[PDB]
Design a protein around this nucleic acid. Sequence first.
RNA 1: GUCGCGGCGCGCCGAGGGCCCGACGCCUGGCGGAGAAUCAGGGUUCGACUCCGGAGAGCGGGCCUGCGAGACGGCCCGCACAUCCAAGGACGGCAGCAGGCGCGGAACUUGCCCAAUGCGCGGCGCGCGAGGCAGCGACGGGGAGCGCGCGAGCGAGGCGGGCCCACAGCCCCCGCCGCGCAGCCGAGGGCAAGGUCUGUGCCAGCAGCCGCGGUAAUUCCAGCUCGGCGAGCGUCGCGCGGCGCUGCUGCAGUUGAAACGCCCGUAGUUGGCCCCCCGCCGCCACGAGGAAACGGGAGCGCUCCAGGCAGGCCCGUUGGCCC
Lengths: 129, 176, 67, 140, 116
Amino acid sequence: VRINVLRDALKSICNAQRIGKKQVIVRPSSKVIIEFLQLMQKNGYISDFAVVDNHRSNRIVVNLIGRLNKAGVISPRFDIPANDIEKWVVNLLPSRLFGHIILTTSQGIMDHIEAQHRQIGGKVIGYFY
Amino acid sequence: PRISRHRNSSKTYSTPKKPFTKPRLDAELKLCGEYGLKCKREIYRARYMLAKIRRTARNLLTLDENDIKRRFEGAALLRRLHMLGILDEEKDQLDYVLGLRIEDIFKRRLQSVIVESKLAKSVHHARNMIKARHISVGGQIVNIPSYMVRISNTSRVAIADTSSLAPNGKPGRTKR
Amino acid sequence: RAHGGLTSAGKVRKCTPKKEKKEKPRPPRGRAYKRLLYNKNFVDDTLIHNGRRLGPNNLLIRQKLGF
Amino acid sequence: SGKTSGLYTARKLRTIRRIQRWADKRYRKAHLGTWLKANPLEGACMARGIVTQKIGISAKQPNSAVRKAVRVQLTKNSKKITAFVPRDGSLTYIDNNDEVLVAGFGRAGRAVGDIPGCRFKVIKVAGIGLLALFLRKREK
Amino acid sequence: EITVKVRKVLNNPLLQRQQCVVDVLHPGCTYESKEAIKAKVAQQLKVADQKNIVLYGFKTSFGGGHTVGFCNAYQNMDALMKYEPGFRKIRCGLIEAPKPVSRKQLKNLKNRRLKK
RNA sequence: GUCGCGGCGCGCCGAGGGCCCGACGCCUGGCGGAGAAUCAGGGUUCGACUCCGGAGAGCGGGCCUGCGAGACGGCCCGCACAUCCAAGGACGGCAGCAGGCGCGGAACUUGCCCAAUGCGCGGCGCGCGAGGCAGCGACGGGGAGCGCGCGAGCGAGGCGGGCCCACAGCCCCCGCCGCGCAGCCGAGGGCAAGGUCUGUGCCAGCAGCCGCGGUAAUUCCAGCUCGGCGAGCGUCGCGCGGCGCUGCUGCAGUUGAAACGCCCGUAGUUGGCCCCCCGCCGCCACGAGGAAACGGGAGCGCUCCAGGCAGGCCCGUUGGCCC
C-alpha cells in the first residue's frame, strides 16, 4: 500500500501542472506534506493550499500558480553531512542560484540555504524546483 | 633506514590525455618557437602549475568571501603571482587569476626577460647566452634559462660581471 | 607450391636490392630543432603554403625542397 | 525492479554486488584465480623456454600465409606454449631447443591477429632480442 | 676583496670560544684559501690569538662567491686542544695524526683476542 | 597455578554456548594499519620494505640466566640437511652486512668509517656490516645540452689549486686548456605524418582493432621525404580510469542477456495517518582527548628545479594550521 505519501502527492501536483490544471486534489494528507506545501507556497512555486479535513487521513486541495518545474522525494530519507549538502544540490537541483532541496532538522524542516546559514545537517524530505 | 628513502620527489609535468591533436600540437610548436622552449616537457611543467593555481582559486571560489581559510589562502595565492610579476598587480582577485595563460609563465623566464632588455635580441640567443652564464641576476650568475625572475629582480638582471660586455677579463673570441 | 612455409623463410627481405643512404647533415637538435620546425610552418608559410598550406609531405611541396 | 533501497537494506546491496560482480568475464578472469593457475605465463611478463619444434601456422582466412612459429616448453611450469617469432625470416635466427624468452601477444592471453592459437610471441632467442637480430643491431 | 665582516657571533663560555658565521664578498677570482682568510678573520673576531681561530665548512656559491663558513675562535689554545673535533685539528696541525688501522683490522684482531 | 583476572589446569555440579543479522567447516601466490596508485563526485585497487604494532629466526618442542627472552650472532633435545676429522670424536643455523648458489622475467660492492645520527659502557673514549660515506645503479623524479653569431661565446671535458670530506671524492669556485655530442617508434584510418620511386606477388611479411599483400601494396622489404615524442623512445604483464560494461549516486529484464509455471509462507526488508513539548532511541551539530612522516598549506631564491625547514642583521626568527 502507500509507504511514501509525499511522493505520491507531489507526483500528482507535477502531473496536474503538465495538463495545466490549477486545482489538484491530494487524497492522502500528512504533516510532512503540510510542511512541504508550506515551503513551496513561501517560495511561491505553489499558491494557497486548502485541507478538507475528514474524520480519516484528510485530503488537501492545492491551487497551483503554474510555476513549478518539478518536485520529488528522496527514498530512503538519507543522512546528509551539513558540509556535503552542496553536493546534494549540485546533482539534484539545476544551478546553485535556483531551486530548493527541502531538509528536516532537529531545529525544524528547513531550506538547504537556511541549513547552510546555520551549518546544521539533517535528513532530506525531498526537493522542488 | 637510509634517510635517502625519506627524501621525496613530485610529478611536475602532465602529458595530454589526447596525445595527437593536430591543432593543439601546432600551437605548442608556435609556443616552442616564440618562447625558445626546449621540448614539450618544458611546456607541460608550466601548464601543470597554471592549472593547479587556477584550481586553487576555484577551490577558494566555493568558500565565502573573507572566510578565515579563504582570506589566508587568497592573500597568499595573489601575492605569489604579482610577486613573480605574472598577474596584474592592482586586480588581486580570484577571477583575474582564472584568466592566466602559460604565456605569463613563459614571460617569467630569465631568457625571456633578456629579449625585452635587448641583451641577446633573440630567445635562442638569450638561451645560448644563459648557458655561457653571460647574464647575471643582481650578483647571481645564472646557468639555467628558467630562473623565473621575481618582479623586483628585472632591474637587477644585467650582463654578468664576469668577462662579457664591459669585460672583467678576456671573453670568448677575444680570449680565443 | 603456394604455401612455401619454413622453406620460404627470408624471401622478400633476402630478395630485396640494397639502396644506399644518401649522406645528409645533422638536424639542429635542441630548442633549435623546434625553432627550425616553426620556421618551416608558422614562419615563412612558403614551404608548406603553396598559396595555402598543403601539408608537410605533399608531392607538390616536395621538389620545392629539391625532393 | 526496486533495487532494494531501504535504510536498513545495506547487507542486501553489498551481497548483490559481490555475487553479481562475478558475471563480468573480465572481472572473472582477473579475480577468479583461474587464469593465474592456468596461465603458461603465470603472473609473469615473460619466461625462459626451450623450442619444442619450429612449425609455421596457416593464418585464419581471409588472410593466407604460413606464419612461422615455434612450439616452446617453459622452464617454470613445463607447459608448452605456441610462440610466434615476429618480423621477417626471424625463424632462421632460432635453432631447435634454443633458449627463448617469450611474452604475450598483447591481448592478455587472447590470440592476436590471423595467427590461430597464439596467446604469446617470441621476444628473445639465446640472449639476443629478435628485433636486435633482425635490425642487425646485435648479431646472434 | 676579503670582505669577511663575520656575522652570528656567539660566545660559548662552556667551550671557552666564540664561534661565528663568516661571509667573504670576493668578486671574480676565488678568495686565496682558508688560512690566508684566517688572518683577516682574527682581526674581525678581535680574539687577537691567530691559533684558536679555525673555520669549519666552506662553500663558494654558484657564480658570485659569498662563501658562508663558521670560524671557531677560542679564548685559549688549550681550550681548543681540550675541545676540537680531532679530524679538523689534525688538518690544521694543532694536533698530529697517529694514523690508525683499517677498522676491519681492529675487528679481525678483536675477534682473535676474543678467541683467547 | 600465575605478576595477575580468567576453564588458565584440576576435581565437582548442572546443561548449556553458537547460528539464513551466514554460525561451524573449508580455502587464502592472507601480515595489519599509518598509508599508496588512479581519479569530477561517488567509487575502485593495493597494502613485502621507511613509521607503528604484531610474528618468526631450517622445523617442532623444552629451558636456565636475568629487571625483563619460552632469546636461537644463549643452551638442551626430537626431526631434517650439513661441516671438521688423525675415524676415536667434534661442531652447525647470512628471514644482520657484503658475497656465493638454487630459482625466477627480475634486483647492487666478500667497499670504506664511527666524525656526525643515535645507542652501549662509567665524567674524562672507545665499541657498533646500527648509521654515515663512497661504488654499481636509464626503478624512477628534476634541472640543463647538441648551438649561436657574422663570427659573438661557452660547458662537457682535461690539468693544477681553493675548498669539501673520518679521509677521499662529487659539486661549486678559481686560473689555464678548452674535443656540442640523439635517438626510438611510426605516415590507409582510429591517430599526427608522402594521390613519391624500389623489390615482392595471399608468398614473405604487416596488422592491439578494422584491415593490407592474389604482378600498377597510401598497409610488406628497401630508398626518399615527413610526423610524434625526446636522452629518452619502443615492448610485455598488472592496477585505475575509460566503463553509468557492476550501476548507493547510477544499469538493464515485451522483442538485444534476463520476472521464478503458479500460489501459501517463516526469517528478512518495508510498513496510512495520528498525540507538539519527556524518556530512551537512532539522527544532526558542537566540543574534548588521542605521534609524526604523508596529503594539503604559511614562510623561505637549493644559481633554477626536483628539494629542504630552512634562514636572517630576526614573532621570544621561523618551521603556523588542517588532516
